[PDB]
Structure formats: structure tokens, C-alpha cells
Design a binder for this molecule. Sequence first.
Ligand SMILES: CC(C)CN(C[C@@H](O)[C@H](Cc1ccccc1)NC(=O)O[C@H]1CO[C@H]2OCC[C@H]21)S(=O)(=O)c1ccc(CO)cc1
Lengths: 99, 99
Amino acid sequence: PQITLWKRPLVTIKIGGQLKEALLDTGADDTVLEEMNLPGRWKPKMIGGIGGFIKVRQYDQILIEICGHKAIGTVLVGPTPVNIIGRNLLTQIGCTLNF
Amino acid sequence: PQITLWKRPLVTIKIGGQLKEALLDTGADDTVLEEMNLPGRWKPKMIGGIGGFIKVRQYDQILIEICGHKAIGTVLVGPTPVNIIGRNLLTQIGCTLNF
Ligand SMILES: CC(C)CN(C[C@@H](O)[C@H](Cc1ccccc1)NC(=O)O[C@H]1CO[C@H]2OCC[C@H]21)S(=O)(=O)c1ccc(CO)cc1
């Protein structure tokens, strides 16, 4: 599908057996999701943007379904105000910018 | 053009007669540029990112060209880690997400 940018590009995703709303974010290198209790191992990480840094937990090889498109990769979990789908997963669903 | 997301979608912009590199950021509502000198009046504002809130100068109705596509809209100037082009200008150049 084609998504216009009049409003925030929010889409439904499926991760760890849960449906969530997430932002398709071409400005995010990696995916960052709101706090959730994912099983498995993880390693600490710090990611920065406007306002400074937040501490996140990096999970590897996490399967996420984005608008019926499946994708598996790195997922960061921490106190982000929004679920953010980053380029590491956007490439896996064939997402492009067009103008 | 069509832009894949295996690399940061960086483009050259022109604002105030000066060239810069900026990030096409579908996850940003607004356009925020690093500290620079711009002509015209402004008003202090606050904007929140992943790491908190920062103080920015709001310039209204500023001419800005993005990949040879002209836009005229709001430009925020402050201590952002990266020059980001937000949806307020992405819509003006006809940018969409496609997958
Ligand atoms: C700054 C950019 C280079 C990088 N970020 C992506 C942006 O899209 C960010 C997303 C966002 C964060 C918080 C609330 C809404 C959207 N948007 C943003 O700051 O927009 C500002 C200006 O316009 C307003 O609209 C929304 C907020 C205001 S990041 O979040 O910090 C980030 C950093 C590292 C990783 C892992 O690699 C993943 C994500």
C-alpha cells in the first residue's frame, strides 16, 4: 500500500503474541518498542535523539509482522513514548520513500 | 525518486541560501535543524523527542529546497543531534511511504 504523511504513519504490528500500534519511521536506524516483557536474552544499550538518551534492552532475531508482512531482526525495548519501526525492519517489508 | 532504506535517507537541502545534509524522517512531525543563523523573526518553543524536551527557535514560512523540490513551512532550530525533515515538509514535496 501507499501511506501519505498528512498524519503520523501509524500501523498495526504483531510481536510476542501482541498487537500494537507503531510508527513507520525512516529516521530510526533500529526498531524501538514501548516497555514490554519479552522472554529470552538481551543486552543493554543506549540510543540517543532529541532530548538525549534512553536505556533500552536489545533483543535479537525477534519476529514482527507489519501490515501482514513478516520481518525478523533486532528489537530494542525501553521507555520510548511511541512504538517505532526502524529501517532494520522497514527494509525487510520492502518499504521505500517516493517523491 | 524511489529511496530504499538500507542506508540513512540523507539528502542535500538548501535553506537560507546554504546547503546542508538532512534526514528524511517520517517519524518526525516537525522539521528540526541544527544550530544555524536564519533571517527573519522567530519565537521560542519546546519539542520532545525520544530522550526528552529541547528548546528551539521556530521560523515560520521559511523557503527550503529538498532534492530540488521546493517547500515553504515551519523550521525549528535547536540542539538536535541530526538535521531532520519532518512530515510538515515531506507532505509539501509529495513524499509517501510505499511497500
Ligand atoms: C531524531 C532522529 C534522527 C532519530 N529518531 C527517530 C525520529 O523519527 C523520532 C521518533 C519519535 C520519538 C519520540 C516521539 C515521537 C517520534 N522523531 C522525533 O524526534 O520528532 C520530533 C520533531 O518532530 C516531532 O515529531 C515527533 C517527535 C518530534 S529517535 O526517536 O530519537 C531514535 C534514535 C535511535 C533508534 C535506534 O537506532 C530509534 C529511534
